[PDB]
Ligand SMILES: Nc1nc2c(ncn2[C@@H]2O[C@H](COP(=O)(O)OP(=O)(O)NP(=O)(O)O)[C@@H](O)[C@H]2O)c(=O)[nH]1
Ligand SMILES: [Ca+2]
């Protein structure tokens with residue numbers, strides 16, 4: 001079957017681990033245990049295709065080198081995390097030595113009310129990169145499968 005190597009990156013505390021764990025294990029991690037480097041693997045059917053997903057959960061270059069697609073995550077209630085997305089874009093360019101890498105911009109914690117990053121603002125950034133913008137909530141599961149599955153579909157268009 002086809003294996004897809006996905007990598008989740010972004011500032012500390014934006015919800016990278018919670019997103020990955022919600023997708024793979026179907027539960028919300030409420031506590032905040034900073035990640036060093038973890039990996040998850042699971043078989044799922046996407047668009048009729050049985051897929052093996054290998055997901056690298058990073059801390060907010062070597063281990064990311066094999067990544068085929070990246071989720072660049074920021075939190076909608078953390079303006080600085082949005083402003084620093086370029087740092088992760090730069091790292092991905094360095095590790096893959098390419099300006100054409102499958103990616104999805106993710107605005108997480110959309111269930112929270114203290115929003116400082118408006119959807120339109122993120123849409124404009126995603127448009128400049130030529131990638132989709134999807135909002136998610138690791139807490140309610142909103143958009144979680146959509147974000148990861150869309151990344152797979154982006155890798156397919158590659
Ligand atoms: N309300 C809400 N809280 C969230 C959401 N995603 C994550 N959190 C909370 O935010 C905190 C940090 O989440 P975590 O997944 O550990 O973030 P991280 O990006 O993986 N951190 P690190 O880079 O240090 O590894 C946790 O207390 C977690 O419950 C979300 O969608 N909604
Ligand atoms: Ca703990």
Ligand SMILES: [Mg+2]
Nearest residue numbers: 016017034035
């Ligand atoms: Mg983490």
Ligand SMILES: [Mg+2]
Nearest residue numbers: 116117118121
């Ligand atoms: Mg503003």
